[PDB]
Amino acid sequence: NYQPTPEDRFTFGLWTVGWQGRDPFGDATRRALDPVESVRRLAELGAHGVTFHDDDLIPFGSSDSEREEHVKRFRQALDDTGMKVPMATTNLFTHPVFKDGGFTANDRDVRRYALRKTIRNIDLAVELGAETYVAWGGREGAESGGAKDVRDALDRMKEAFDLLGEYVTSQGYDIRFAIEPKPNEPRGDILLPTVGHALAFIERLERPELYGVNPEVGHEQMAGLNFPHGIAQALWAGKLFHIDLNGQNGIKYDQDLRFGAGDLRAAFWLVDLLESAGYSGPRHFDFKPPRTEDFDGVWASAAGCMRNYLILKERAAAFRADPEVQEALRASRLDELARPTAADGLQALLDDRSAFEEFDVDAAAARGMAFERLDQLAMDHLLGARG
Amino acid sequence: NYQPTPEDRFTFGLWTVGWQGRDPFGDATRRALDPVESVRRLAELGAHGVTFHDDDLIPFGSSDSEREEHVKRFRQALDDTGMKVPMATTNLFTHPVFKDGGFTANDRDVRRYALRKTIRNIDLAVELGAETYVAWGGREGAESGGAKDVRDALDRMKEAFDLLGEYVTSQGYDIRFAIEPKPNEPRGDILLPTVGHALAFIERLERPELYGVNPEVGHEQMAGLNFPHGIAQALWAGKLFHIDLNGQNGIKYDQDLRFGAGDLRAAFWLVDLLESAGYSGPRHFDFKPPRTEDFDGVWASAAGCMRNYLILKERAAAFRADPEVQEALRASRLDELARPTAADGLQALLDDRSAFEEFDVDAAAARGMAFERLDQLAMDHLLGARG
Amino acid sequence: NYQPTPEDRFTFGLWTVGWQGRDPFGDATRRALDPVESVRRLAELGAHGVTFHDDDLIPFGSSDSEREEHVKRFRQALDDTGMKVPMATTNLFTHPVFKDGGFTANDRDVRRYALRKTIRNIDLAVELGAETYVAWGGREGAESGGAKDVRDALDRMKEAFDLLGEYVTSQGYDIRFAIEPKPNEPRGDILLPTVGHALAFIERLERPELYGVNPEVGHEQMAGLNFPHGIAQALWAGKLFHIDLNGQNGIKYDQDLRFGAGDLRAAFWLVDLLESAGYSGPRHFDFKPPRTEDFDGVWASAAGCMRNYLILKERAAAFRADPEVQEALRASRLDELARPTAADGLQALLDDRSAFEEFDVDAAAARGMAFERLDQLAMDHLLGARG
Amino acid sequence: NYQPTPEDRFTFGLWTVGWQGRDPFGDATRRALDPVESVRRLAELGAHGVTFHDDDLIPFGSSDSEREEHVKRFRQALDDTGMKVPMATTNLFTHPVFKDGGFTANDRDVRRYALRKTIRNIDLAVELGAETYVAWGGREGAESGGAKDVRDALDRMKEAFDLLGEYVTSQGYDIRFAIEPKPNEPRGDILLPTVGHALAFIERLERPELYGVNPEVGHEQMAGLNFPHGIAQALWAGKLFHIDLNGQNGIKYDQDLRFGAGDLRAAFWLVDLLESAGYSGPRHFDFKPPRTEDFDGVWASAAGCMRNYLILKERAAAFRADPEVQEALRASRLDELARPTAADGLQALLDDRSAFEEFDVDAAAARGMAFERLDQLAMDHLLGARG
Ligand SMILES: OC[C@H]1O[C@H](O)[C@H](O)[C@@H](O)[C@@H]1O
Ligand SMILES: OC[C@H]1O[C@H](O)[C@H](O)[C@@H](O)[C@@H]1O
Ligand SMILES: OC[C@H]1O[C@H](O)[C@H](O)[C@@H](O)[C@@H]1O
Ligand SMILES: OC[C@H]1O[C@H](O)[C@H](O)[C@@H](O)[C@@H]1O
Ligand SMILES: OC[C@H]1O[C@H](O)[C@H](O)[C@@H](O)[C@@H]1O
Ligand SMILES: OC[C@H]1O[C@H](O)[C@H](O)[C@@H](O)[C@@H]1O
Ligand SMILES: OC[C@H]1O[C@H](O)[C@H](O)[C@@H](O)[C@@H]1O
Ligand SMILES: OC[C@H]1O[C@H](O)[C@H](O)[C@@H](O)[C@@H]1O
Ligand SMILES: OC[C@H]1O[C@](O)(CO)[C@@H](O)[C@@H]1O
Ligand SMILES: OC[C@H]1O[C@](O)(CO)[C@@H](O)[C@@H]1O
Ligand SMILES: OC[C@H]1O[C@](O)(CO)[C@@H](O)[C@@H]1O
Ligand SMILES: OC[C@H]1O[C@](O)(CO)[C@@H](O)[C@@H]1O
Ligand SMILES: OC[C@H]1O[C@](O)(CO)[C@@H](O)[C@@H]1O
Ligand SMILES: OC[C@H]1O[C@](O)(CO)[C@@H](O)[C@@H]1O
Ligand SMILES: OC[C@H]1O[C@](O)(CO)[C@@H](O)[C@@H]1O
Ligand SMILES: OC[C@H]1O[C@](O)(CO)[C@@H](O)[C@@H]1O
Ligand SMILES: [Mn+2]
Ligand SMILES: [Mn+2]
Ligand SMILES: [Mn+2]
Ligand SMILES: [Mn+2]
Ligand SMILES: [Mn+2]
Ligand SMILES: [Mn+2]
Ligand SMILES: [Mn+2]
Ligand SMILES: [Mn+2]
Ligand SMILES: [Mn+2]
Ligand SMILES: [Mn+2]
Ligand SMILES: [Mn+2]
Ligand SMILES: [Mn+2]
Ligand SMILES: [Mn+2]
Ligand SMILES: [Mn+2]
Ligand SMILES: [Mn+2]
Ligand SMILES: [Mn+2]
Ligand SMILES: [Mn+2]
Ligand SMILES: [Mn+2]
Ligand SMILES: [Mn+2]
Ligand SMILES: [Mn+2]
Ligand SMILES: [Mn+2]
Ligand SMILES: [Mn+2]
């Protein structure tokens, strides 16, 4: 049961299963994985494809010829396995040159370099067939208030994305950008810290249609935000281009637990919303097998990502299909929420005495919402306890 | 020193100093304040003006004759003191009818009622000279995941704000709207939980130019976010129509401490930003004197709000004027951040070898940012260890 | 399925199902419940018993004769239904006199009054057969740093509990005290903010054996702490006298959701630990049906508390009984954790070359912990997805 | 002004200024610092001393001859500067062997190794003149609920500390132990997560008088707790053996900002408490110059730590000396808090009608606490708006 297949569109970053277990207080506990090994093992587990930072696939500082060779080996593995590369991204955070940012470094020469590094890898992404190009500005921010004028930083962020827009437009590429928010870590505060801030920003870009969000479960949870609500907003705006799935236990460092771990109920409501909305993008896992684990545990953790998505999918489908839930949805007036408030228009509203002068506010107030019964059906479904 | 005058544009909600001290675990510790007394006492302390919810000024359910009497008394005290009313707002949260929201209540009739109640108060705000009308959707949200389809709720929110914009335009009113975010409380999760989410939503409205944000110090802090950063993004977008100033000690219930209390450094960096940016709107305090206090403490706390703003203004000004700080700003390349990355344009960037093949990435990486020195000069100035 | 009965030892505060829905931003949405009604309805749902604050059962300020009458009616209901009263507590937080605390009010006359109120209700608790007397110092704390010398406050807290100890000892009562931690709300910071701080404090009391903790799921979660870890510590110390069960979604105001809601996985690990440890005290629900609900929803929410405990119990028992989990526990060396580190003693340890000079650190390092596979079995069990 | 001198007892970890800037998302930005250089540079800035983990001073795996060489060089620099070594500690977290803990690793052999590694360094700490030996159980904990039986882990922790106490007693060493709490990071939840939990644990040890706490400003803040309150509880218990001073901006990853940065008011109230209490231990900074910084910024940040302590000391002293503050303290009844509730004893309290039947609860309730005025005088003093 719950065996994933390519139809489920599960993808993994090379850096996920490849994470060697180095944390701020600890050395690596696992050897480096060859990207080819990761492609084959994930394919065997039922993955649809993989994603990469430039520097995951090609060691920083490789010559043109070594770079060709890294890419060729990886392509070969993709071809043998049928694995795809739906997304790609830039490492603008590891090299010490990026210590104050890539696109919003105070040093202009660094910001230019950030863009050139990005553009080179956009060409590679396109060659590999990537439809989304993720930007995570992990170094864009500050630890102190006078280090970063955030209005200037946003000008430079806009300038950078606008230039990327012009680049992909000039080349005739079908690739869209997805901005991945995170509120802090490894900067004290990161710019565009949440889905909202990234959606807002995108509207000020010269070609806003080329840009969307790549939200991450744990990142919105590091600001204590409701992740399914934020995905709903992104879907309402037409901007959910990609998603990173994982787990997180509240407000703390970014844990990057396998999906289903962390806030299990929020995972449930998330699957429900994505499936209800018909989200057709990759179900991409950005997680890290804990450094406690050997390679067998790495693969178990990867497999558990996909397993939990499928169990949740089944329970959410069973919840939405249950006629008793559908009656509960009516009792709670979810159907009334979907009706326009005033299709009759402003003047009709103002002339409607029953909306104000004759509104019996106490009778409306007395109506229970029936949300707890609804939510207990949802719980019973999640837990497969439908009595 | 630090005596506020009405030119400082300090305003207060009636519900601030008028808070009777009822919290979820306790009864009122103070008697109701007549709004006349609030107006007079705040003017004597050097306030510029007051703001109100409809229900602070006119108790819910008042007859027309009671309404006229409450407004007449309030108008006389405004007259007598010279106090302005720059902002007003609707209470769409207290009354049991609003338990599932106003604009996004699942019941349609409640949504229409919310709109009518709002509209009525827009008229009154205009009569009193308000330039901004705030919306705080405190009840818009959910405790449980099935209770609220967030995409439908956002359709309903957009409808409501669009109708309000249609109303003010049809009436020829100069007033603009400001959305005040809050992440949670009294709902488990509130819709448009942060400055980013509200900013993004506005761009989807029919007349986006009529709508900005009214961010609150404590509310962004309740999501663990950087409030000065949030304000910078609002200013960058042209959307800082109004602000609520107060204090909060991290991620917990909404404390509404006096301005200056809570995160003092963030208060410093906020004042620096507002004053640097030439923000010309009201410096509005949304705070609650703690229920420990009697009426004499109410006034002390309100005076404290204004005094802290002025002390921090002086310290920020001394910081910016210090020749050591200016040299520090240059050593930290804040001036370079303000300049374009690639005003030579995309093709010149792509052709610039110094941006990529010939960029000495180790030399750039080795150059310290000098942020700690800069930040210590800021601390020195804040603490008055430099004048 | 999952029908609760008195054998499950589920209890409810009168104030839980009786909460009228007043929050800091909202009026009551439900009428007051008669305590007799609450006793009968809970009995019908399969509850074992009820708990009370003095002021839930007897309106503050009742005369001796009205007080007798309130108590008599309640006793009658207990007798008809067979409901018990295993715990009782004092309201030292609602009346404005307690605005700076009961036991640690700065005013000495208030602290004395706090003790007299408490002692009167301890006599009533005993008469009703209560074995635990809970203290929740919801008002003990501060909003500002100079208001409360916390060393003095702790002296006064110790003095108060020591006097209560002497009282119950002098009267020959079999009643034990359980201190309920909460980190903040309605004070900015509450004294003894966590299980740890309360356990620590108890060790400085004159008769520490008379005192334990009454931890609450949501309260430890408001400090972002692992609730099952804290219960484990309390059980390790012999101090888990009582427990409050409910749900909470991270770090925010105290939500008091029905149990199972909030952090569902932490609910699972909690049930597992309590059942594994043979906790024999009440399974007491301190929750509040959301103010969205009418009385039918109040009773559904109460019923869902108990239902979720039973589902979780079943899954946790199935997890612990599964031989495949037992092999996984061995693979992860949980059994080795339970063995003494050095029963051979200090000198033997120092003479053991294989523990240091000849310890192959790299071979030990290479061993995977197998925790992810273990945890995925736990997930599969929780979700009833054992494939 | 505010030049530190060695009498101020300011100490620094080698790992503080020596931090090379490697974080989970980035490589080192600074070269390794020779501990000799750290000792010399900190002495010139007016430090009192340094502290170390075994592995900071002697790289993991050093031969005896390398060990002697590293220690000789360090001893000469201590000699040359007059710098003390008041505290030392074990690195039981970096090496992959410690991935599931040292003292509470599930594998027994790892636990024994942790103890032997610790013991060896206790000898060295004593040789260098340390009075305190810190334990920080950074790896003791779990990511998942089944991985760690917390009751068994606490049996193992107690065993370990008891063995260490047996060791120092058998050797006749004057050294005492201090447990440093942290709630999470690098483990999902760490055991003994706060000051309270560590304090409670100590009372269960065989020789509790040998053990206190080494609380860290940022660590308690990572649970959203009040650090000055935590310190007051440690002082009240006689257990504040050592302290780590730094800064943190709320609930997130461990920032380790310089002291003064982060929550400035909490830093003020901490200094007031330490100085009022006559705390005589080291003022130890556990901070990391941000990786943005070069070596000149490293020194600026370290100097900033000491300077902020001294500025805050002066401001707290001026606050306590101000005649208006003294009157404010009396108006707020801080003096009454310091006096007993009922030194007349239980029977006199029970017989005192003024404590109950005849207590005028409305008059007491009406008396304001005047905390806001007091707190504004504190703000004035902190900001230098009063001298
Ligand atoms: O206190 C934290 C720091 O101390 C130790 O030196 C570790 O080796 C370092 O990597 C760690 O992050
Ligand atoms: O953007 C690509 C990825 O970059 C880094 O690995 C991040 O830590 C991550 O969350 C992100 O999803
Ligand atoms: O930081 C604020 C300054 O930089 C901004 O990004 C704007 O371009 C400029 O007009 C403003 O005055
Ligand atoms: O009643 C006060 C409420 O409405 C106002 O618009 C406020 O800014 C919001 O913070 C608050 O709770
Ligand atoms: O901003 C918050 C306050 O504003 C309004 O006056 C409400 O009536 C009050 O109860 C609320 O808590
Ligand atoms: O102590 C009894 C109860 O008192 C109050 O109702 C609290 O808010 C609660 O959590 C506690 O459990
Ligand atoms: O606040 C600190 C003072 O109060 C304490 O609780 C002690 O009893 C006293 O010795 C100390 O000096
Ligand atoms: O390496 C630094 C580590 O060990 C020390 O004992 C520290 O106080 C702790 O905060 C830290 O991470
Ligand atoms: O420091 C703890 C580290 O552990 C992880 O959560 C993976 O288990 C990383 O995301 C993090 O950097
Ligand atoms: O002050 C109102 C309070 O009364 C209670 O019922 C306590 O008996 C609490 O839940 C509620 O918060
Ligand atoms: O103007 C009519 C209103 O005025 C009052 O009489 C004042 O006492 C209200 O009770 C009534 O509805
Ligand atoms: O001191 C004012 C604040 O304190 C509380 O009463 C605590 O529950 C809040 O509701 C309010 O914002
Ligand atoms: O303010 C929100 C209120 O709602 C509750 O969570 C119950 O649904 C209360 O615990 C809280 O006071
Ligand atoms: O700098 C180390 C980093 O390298 C990555 O693999 C990115 O490719 C990240 O997960 C990790 O944190
Ligand atoms: O003292 C022996 C040690 O000294 C070194 O030779 C220094 O280069 C080490 O490699 C060796 O183990
Ligand atoms: O600036 C020092 C701090 O910044 C980080 O590098 C961010 O990941 C932390 O690990 C460290 O405490
Ligand atoms: Mn399938
Ligand atoms: Mn990128
Ligand atoms: Mn600027
Ligand atoms: Mn969790
Ligand atoms: Mn992440
Ligand atoms: Mn991600
Ligand atoms: Mn809103
Ligand atoms: Mn604070
Ligand atoms: Mn607020
Ligand atoms: Mn506000
Ligand atoms: Mn510019
Ligand atoms: Mn049963
Ligand atoms: Mn009590
Ligand atoms: Mn004192
Ligand atoms: Mn949750
Ligand atoms: Mn609670
Ligand atoms: Mn409780
Ligand atoms: Mn420990
Ligand atoms: Mn801060
Ligand atoms: Mn730290
Ligand atoms: Mn530390
Ligand atoms: Mn005393």
Residue numbers in the entry:
A (entry chain A), B (entry chain B), C (entry chain A), D (entry chain B): 2 to 388
Question: Which sentences did the original study use to describe this structure?
Answer:
Dehydration may change the crystal lattice and affect the mosaicity, resolution and quality of X-ray diffraction data. In one case, that of glucose isomerase, dehydration triggering a change of space group from I222 to P21212 was observed. In all three cases the P21212 space group was observed at both 295 and 100 K, and cryocooling the crystal caused a unit-cell volume decrease of 4.5%. The structures of the 295 and 100 K crystals at RH 96% and RH 70% have been solved. Ultimately, the data provided here show that the complete dehydration experiment should pursue a wholly 295 K experiment and a laboratory-based 100 K study, as well as extended investigations where indicated. By adopting the approach described in Fig. 1, glucose isomerase was identified as a system of interest for the dehydration experiment and it has been possible to identify the nature of the changes induced by dehydration through the two structures presented.
Another three crystals were mounted directly into a stream of air at a RH of 70% and data were collected at 295 K and subsequently at 100 K from each crystal. The RH at which dehydration triggers a change in space group was tested and identified. Dehydration to a RH of 85% or lower triggers the space-group change from I222 to P21212, and dehydration to a RH of 90% or higher does not impact the lattice. To better understand the effect of dehydration on the crystal packing, the structures of the I222 and P21212 isoforms of glucose isomerase were superposed using the first chain of each structure. The Cα backbones from the two structures have an overall root-mean-squared deviation (r.m.s.d.) of 0.412 as calculated using LSQ Superpose implemented in Coot. This indicates that any changes induced by dehydration occur globally, i.e. within the lattice, rather than at the individual monomer level. The rotation of the tetramers means the lattice face defined by the a and b axes of the P21212 space group is rotated 12° with respect to the original I222 ab face. The rotation induces the appearance of screw axes along both the a and b axes of the I222 lattice, giving rise to the P21212 lattice. Along the I222 a axis the molecules spread out and the cell expands from 94 to 95 Å, but along the b axis the unit-cell dimension reduces by 16 Å. As already shown by the indexing values, the molecules come closer and the c dimension shrinks from 103 to 98 Å.
